[PDB]
């Protein structure tokens, strides 16, 4: 009857309210966090947490590699209406780079996501959270109705 510790596809409003409910805004950055299905890249996981320094929710994507869960390629900074041509020119190269890296990354991550549903992959997720310095005590646990339906996480309890 155990509930996975991974959230399914939850919306941005709900992400913010879950972090606030668990007092993320009176605790250090990453002391409170949740783990959820990536909405953009199926097979990836996204860690959402509160950044005290910028007063915003931030998100970090992880994917399966042969070594276990690892950080996914990070996208460039979003375009802004004030961007100079120099910013825009750099964005072009960085986006192409991100797209090529992410494509290779998901090609491997999605295959591992599919083959090993009965998985010792769970321990490597805990390892990568520790490397990122997420306080494991501050993990927000989904309720049954909000937990991920993906079979890879059935035993992520
Ligand atoms: N905000 C992140 C990118 C990001 C955005 C959304 C996100 O969630 P999802 O996987 O559901 O798209 C994860 C990561 C960054 O700029 O590095």
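Sequence proposed for the structure above (157 residues):
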């Amino acid at each position: 009857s155990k509930i996975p510790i991974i959230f399914g596809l939850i919306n941005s409003y709900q992400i913010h309210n879950l972090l606030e409910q668990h007092n993320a805004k009176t605790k250090e950055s990453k002391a409170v966090f949740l783990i959820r299905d990536s909405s953009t890249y199926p097979g990836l996981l996204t860690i959402s947490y509160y950044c005290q320094e910028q007063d915003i929710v931030k998100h970090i994507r992880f994917g399966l590699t042969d070594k276990g869960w690892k950080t996914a390629p990070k996208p460039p900074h979003e375009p802004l209406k004030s961007d100079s041509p120099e910013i825009k020119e750099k964005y072009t190269l960085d986006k192409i780079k991100f797209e090529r890296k992410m494509k290779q990354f998901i090609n491997t991550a999605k295959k591992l996501f599919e083959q090993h549903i009965r998985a010792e992959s769970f321990k490597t997720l805990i390892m990568e959270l520790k490397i990122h310095e997420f306080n494991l005590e501050g993990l927000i646990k989904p309720t049954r109705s909000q937990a991920s339906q993906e079979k890879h996480f059935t035993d992520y309890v």
